Design a protein around this ligand. Sequence first.
Ligand SMILES: *[C@@H]1O[C@H](CO)[C@@H](O[C@@H]2O[C@H](CO)[C@@H](O[C@@H]3O[C@H](CO)[C@@H](O)[C@H](O[C@H]4O[C@H](CO)[C@@H](O)[C@H](O)[C@@H]4O[C@H]4O[C@H](CO)[C@@H](O)[C@H](O)[C@@H]4O)[C@@H]3O)[C@H](O)[C@H]2NC(C)=O)[C@H](O)[C@H]1NC(C)=O
Ligand SMILES: Cc1cc2nc3c(=O)[nH]c(=O)nc-3n(C[C@H](O)[C@H](O)[C@H](O)COP(=O)(O)OP(=O)(O)OC[C@H]3O[C@@H](n4cnc5c(N)ncnc54)[C@H](O)[C@@H]3O)c2cc1C
Ligand SMILES: *[C@@H]1O[C@H](CO)[C@@H](O)[C@H](O)[C@H]1NC(C)=O
Ligand SMILES: *[C@@H]1O[C@H](CO)[C@@H](O)[C@H](O)[C@H]1NC(C)=O
Ligand SMILES: *[C@@H]1O[C@H](CO)[C@@H](O)[C@H](O)[C@H]1NC(C)=O
Length: 581
Amino acid sequence: GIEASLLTDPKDVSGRTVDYIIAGGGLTGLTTAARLTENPNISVLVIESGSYESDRGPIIEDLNAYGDIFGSSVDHAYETVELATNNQTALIRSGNGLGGSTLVNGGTWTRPHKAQVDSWETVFGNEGWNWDNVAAYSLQAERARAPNAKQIAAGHYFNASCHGVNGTVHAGPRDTGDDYSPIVKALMSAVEDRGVPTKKDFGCGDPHGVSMFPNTLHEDQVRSDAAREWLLPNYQRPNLQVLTGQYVGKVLLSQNGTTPRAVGVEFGTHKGNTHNVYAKHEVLLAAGSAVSPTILEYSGIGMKSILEPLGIDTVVDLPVGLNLQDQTTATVRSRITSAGAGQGQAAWFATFNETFGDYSEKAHELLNTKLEQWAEEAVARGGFHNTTALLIQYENYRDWIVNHNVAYSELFLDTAGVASFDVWDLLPFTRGYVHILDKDPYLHHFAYDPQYFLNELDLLGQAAATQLARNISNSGAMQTYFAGETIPGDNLAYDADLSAWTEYIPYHFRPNYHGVGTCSMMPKEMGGVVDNAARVYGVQGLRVIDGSIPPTQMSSHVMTVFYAMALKISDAILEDYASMQ
Ligand SMILES: *[C@@H]1O[C@H](CO)[C@@H](O[C@@H]2O[C@H](CO)[C@@H](O[C@@H]3O[C@H](CO)[C@@H](O)[C@H](O[C@H]4O[C@H](CO)[C@@H](O)[C@H](O)[C@@H]4O[C@H]4O[C@H](CO)[C@@H](O)[C@H](O)[C@@H]4O)[C@@H]3O)[C@H](O)[C@H]2NC(C)=O)[C@H](O)[C@H]1NC(C)=O
Ligand SMILES: Cc1cc2nc3c(=O)[nH]c(=O)nc-3n(C[C@H](O)[C@H](O)[C@H](O)COP(=O)(O)OP(=O)(O)OC[C@H]3O[C@@H](n4cnc5c(N)ncnc54)[C@H](O)[C@@H]3O)c2cc1C
Ligand SMILES: *[C@@H]1O[C@H](CO)[C@@H](O)[C@H](O)[C@H]1NC(C)=O
Ligand SMILES: *[C@@H]1O[C@H](CO)[C@@H](O)[C@H](O)[C@H]1NC(C)=O
Ligand SMILES: *[C@@H]1O[C@H](CO)[C@@H](O)[C@H](O)[C@H]1NC(C)=O
């Protein structure tokens, strides 16, 4: 079985040499490892801090048990600094084990707006990173199943052109076996009354309106986590090696040439218990957006002003750990009548004007006039280092909103006994950072600051979207099922205005756990860390391939793009491999 093939003893890899070392056995790391070992000549070693969890039981395998695993040893639970918005620390849920955060997530499978991905090439200069290319790799990864008569009847719509059927990641409609709740169709009807679209397939390139969606699970409803999809079918390959239960602490760099070269990694569990392993070709970082940047910083790749005071010699000065972008989530929950019983999830991808409603003119006024003031403030807070380059990101977001009308907020609906909305502003203007606070990697002492709500439009947009969730819960056809709000319930008057909501939100939100950007893929002059093939600037044989590299947020759930991203980067690595013979 797979468990017997996994390595646990540090001495089984210590001192050996492999072609590629992948730090982190998560979504991008395992997709890359499987892809690279298709060629029998390439040897790959994956080093994962956690272990095999995919067959544990329903706590991992059933998507309906979402949330039960939090706080366990399968959850890294990274703590933020004390946030300025509320003076509290927040926990960042993140999977710890083979498959990473795909072990503990909600399984939602959707794609962004075409214009968002196209801007990676046209605005950020990443040649080849456009919707057409990324979507093609997304389809290649995908193994979707169309909905059946019962599922269609509940509200599903599936455009066959927009889904791959021959790929690797099993995706299909979640179906617990009970009846589907009629609240999903009631919500659709309520938004249809306001001229909002319904049933568009959210994998097609224009996520807008209210629709149901596929989930990453097999037809028998077992979670399609990355280790089940990419590692389980290929674990017997003799060139694929997986070491578990150990942390990668830093990259080993040789400086006896013009340009520094990555030759291996140092791994371990504590400062007194560390081992080295070497790479013939390249070291690939895939430890997650909260960790990959810190691995660079421990290794002497990052800002001198951060590293020098810690007693670390700066080999390459780069803006590692800046440009962190995560979203904020708040909840609106209502009791329903018995008539609404049944399973089902749906989401409203709402545009800027749909979110703000009659406040749209005022919200547009801010968008048009404060971009520069906002960029200066975020830079003064340490979220980014170049005001001009940050202004360009903001102008790009303004373009998406005013010219492309992309979805600005997401209202995610859960039923199964209640009407529960989790809401989030998809496009934050705040920028945060993550930096180490000690030289020892195994101390795990770092400062992670997303700077939630320190940009005024993020606060206004979140409050507007959450107020919209309360409004739509007791509107049109939903009024038949509404049996009283429970959250906020007594904690915020039912007729609260927008300014009241803005005062309530900072005390009642959670991270959305979608942090991207800490090793941003954009030109060096725009504040980038990696180039368009994910190579770290100024270093040979080192790439960062995970959620740290997307330079922007997106109007969707990110698994469809991250699986595509890893496949596209793996092709680039395969070409370079043939070049270095
Ligand atoms: C997160 O925590 C940080 C602190 O760790 C918070 O930041 C601190 O916030 C406090 C305010 O709550 C602030 O203290 C004020 O400093 C001013 C000087 O800059 C003072 O003028 C002010 O004193 C007045 O209020 C006091 C409190 O009631 C009185 O005891 C005092 O005599 C003063 O009273 C006069 O003024 C008040 C109105 O100011 C008036 O009602 C009275 O009649 C009287 O005329 C405070 O001492 C700190 O400077 C802030 N910074 C630091 C580092 O401490 C931050 O707000 C927290 N964030 C959140 C979201 O909670
Ligand atoms: C609670 C939650 C809900 C989500 N819901 C959705 C959803 O519904 N739909 C969706 O599309 N996406 C969702 N996501 C996001 C998606 O799961 C992640 O964006 C994706 O898994 C990130 O992939 P990655 O390869 O960057 O990192 P990960 O998958 O996190 O993997 C990084 C890996 O590195 C390991 N690691 C960490 N530190 C070290 C170290 N020092 N050395 C070695 N290994 C290390 C970690 O244990 C982990 O396995 C959610 C995420 C979370 C946390
Ligand atoms: C399906 O999606 C394609 C986009 O590739 C679109 O052209 C078509 O109109 C959509 N709808 C149907 C009914 O196929
Ligand atoms: C959004 O609202 C603003 C202000 O009313 C308006 O100028 C714009 O045309 C609206 N609609 C769209 C789709 O942008
Ligand atoms: C700041 O970013 C701008 C815009 O990308 C770029 O022209 C400039 O060179 C950057 N400045 C520095 C000093 O890096």
